[PDB]
Design a protein around this ligand. Structure first.
Ligand code: HEM
Ligand SMILES: O=N[O-]
Ligand SMILES: O=N[O-]
Ligand SMILES: O=N[O-]
Ligand SMILES: O=N[O-]
Ligand SMILES: O=N[O-]
Ligand SMILES: O=N[O-]
Ligand SMILES: O=N[O-]
Ligand SMILES: O=N[O-]
Ligand SMILES: O=N[O-]
Ligand SMILES: O=N[O-]
Length: 153
């Protein structure tokens, strides 16, 4: 359970993300695909992309980035009261996309990396700790739902 102070650190850095959600989504997905290339194989629309330059030029990848971060933003803004938002997401990622929890850990690492790089004004150690707690809570609750849904993850 996060404190209100922890939520405020999370939402203060998120507010900077929201100044340019598409840019941040590109940087995050590219970092994920560079760091864990196996994750790219999950995305049929753009799994053929071979290089970071190609990834930056992909309008499809950019749209996906916006989709992911907007969904996560909505969840963060709930400050842990995110049961309704998590249901469809867990279902799709468990049953349609087959995303293991391990890959949610990878994207969480990618998020933290990009925020640390872009937002050192709002992403010092305390803020990073808060965001890690928020993302750990997200993963824990998604993992619980995966098990309910029948997916080992
Ligand atoms: C912060 C974590 C994540 C959030 C909030 C998120 C959110 C979403 C959303 C909202 C969609 C569109 C609606 C849906 O299908 O549920 C989507 C689609 C998808 N997600 Fe995620 N996602 C996350 C992590 C991941 C990860 C780590 C992977 C793969 C390694 C993944 C793979 C996909 C795929 C394959 C699709 C379908 C894309 C397409 O239409 O071609 N997601 N995700
Ligand atoms: O009050 N911040 O844990
Ligand atoms: O693209 N991140 O090293
Ligand atoms: O971009 N992962 O949905
Ligand atoms: O707490 N949401 O499953
Ligand atoms: O969206 N991750 O289950
Ligand atoms: O609900 N899964 O696309
Ligand atoms: O970013 N949470 O997988
Ligand atoms: O991709 N995270 O270090
Ligand atoms: O941000 N999920 O607690
Ligand atoms: O509640 N544990 O994923």
């Amino acid at each position: 359970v996060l404190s209100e102070g922890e939520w405020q650190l999370v939402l203060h850095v998120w507010a900077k993300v929201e100044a340019d959600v598409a840019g941040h989504g590109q940087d995050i997905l590219i970092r994920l695909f560079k760091s864990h290339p196996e994750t790219l194989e999950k995305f049929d629309r753009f799994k053929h992309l071979k290089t970071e330059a190609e990834m930056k030029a992909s309008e499809d990848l950019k749209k996906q980035g916006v989709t992911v971060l907007t969904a996560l933003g909505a969840i963060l803004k709930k400050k842990g009261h995110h049961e309704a938002e998590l249901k469809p997401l867990a279902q799709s990622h468990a049953t349609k996309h087959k995303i293991p929890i391990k890959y949610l850990e990878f994207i969480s690492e990618a998020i933290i990396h990009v925020l640390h790089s872009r937002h050192p004004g709002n992403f010092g150690a305390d803020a990073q700790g808060a965001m890690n707690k928020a993302l750990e809570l997200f993963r824990k609750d998604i993992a619980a739902k995966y098990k309910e849904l029948g997916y080992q993850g």
